[PDB]
Design a protein around this ligand. Sequence first.
Ligand code: 0G6
Ligand code: NAG
Ligand code: NA
Lengths: 40, 250
Amino acid sequence: TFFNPRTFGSGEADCGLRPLFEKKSLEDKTERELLESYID
Amino acid sequence: IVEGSDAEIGMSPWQVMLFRKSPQELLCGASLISDRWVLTAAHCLLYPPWDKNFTENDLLVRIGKHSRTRYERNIEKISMLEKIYIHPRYNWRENLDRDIALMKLKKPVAFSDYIHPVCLPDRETAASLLQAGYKGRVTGWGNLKETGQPSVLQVVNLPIVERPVCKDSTRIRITDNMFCAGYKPDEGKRGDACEGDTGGPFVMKSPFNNRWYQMGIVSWGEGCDRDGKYGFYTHVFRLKKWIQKVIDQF
Ligand SMILES: *C[C@@](*)(O)[C@H](CCCNC(N)=[NH2+])NC(=O)[C@@H]1CCCN1C(=O)[C@H](N)Cc1ccccc1
Ligand SMILES: *[C@@H]1O[C@H](CO)[C@@H](O)[C@H](O)[C@H]1NC(C)=O
Ligand code: NA
């Protein structure tokens, strides 16, 4: 937690995790492209 | 987005649409960073040559959207703005240096399957992920080509390009507050952001914790998807102190 939620509001703790993907352990159709770019 | 494809439903739940009240029109993209803060490009809101100097009252934010044109009942949420903040050193006259703005929502939005905030990078994540050759993702409802407009949110993945290549691709003066992304002529693949995509997020997924981080903001380019040309993005981590100040103080 970087920002103060009193002024930032809620959502930082759970940021960046998508309900329909990460949260369902489902991969989206192209995100493997991103992951594979790190091996390169 | 040129040479991208349709987003999957909920693929980019931090995507925001800035919408003008009257005349009713799509203005640009933006990203949700908390329940009440939205991040976008300054030039969306302030660019006097194009008669853009919007106040809080001219605009609304539409969050959770897929369709560009349809009102999506029970899926999208619309909020008004309490306040707009542009970076005080935003340079619209020359090169769009520090093309960044924050918008505080009048009331927080409820999160849903379709609405959820993106993370902003820390130093280690910025150092680790913002490297030449690594790919991030850009989303928007902007033009499909140089001018048309898509029925639904578009998505494209693009490699970060080395500073010397970015510099030599253009006669516009680039700064450390920008990075460029896109395929080189020798890489064969294509894709770019375009007009209408400004303000939309350039995100990357961390292999360390599986979270999406917003590294950039669609800012500028010369044409769209041209060989030997690259899209430029506001370097979010470089301006995170400003982001922090604004949020902490207001
Ligand atoms: C405002 C945004 O919709 C748009 C994003 C364009 C992204 N294009 C690509 N290929 N990734 N930005 C612009 O249209 C900006 C705003 C002002 C003019 N502009 C340009 O990109 C010009 N084409 C070039 C430029 C002019 C002045 C200063 C910087 C860049
Ligand atoms: C745009 O609006 C402000 C007030 O919000 C005004 O004072 C200013 O002169 C305008 N900015 C520019 C750069 O013209
Ligand atoms: Na190009």
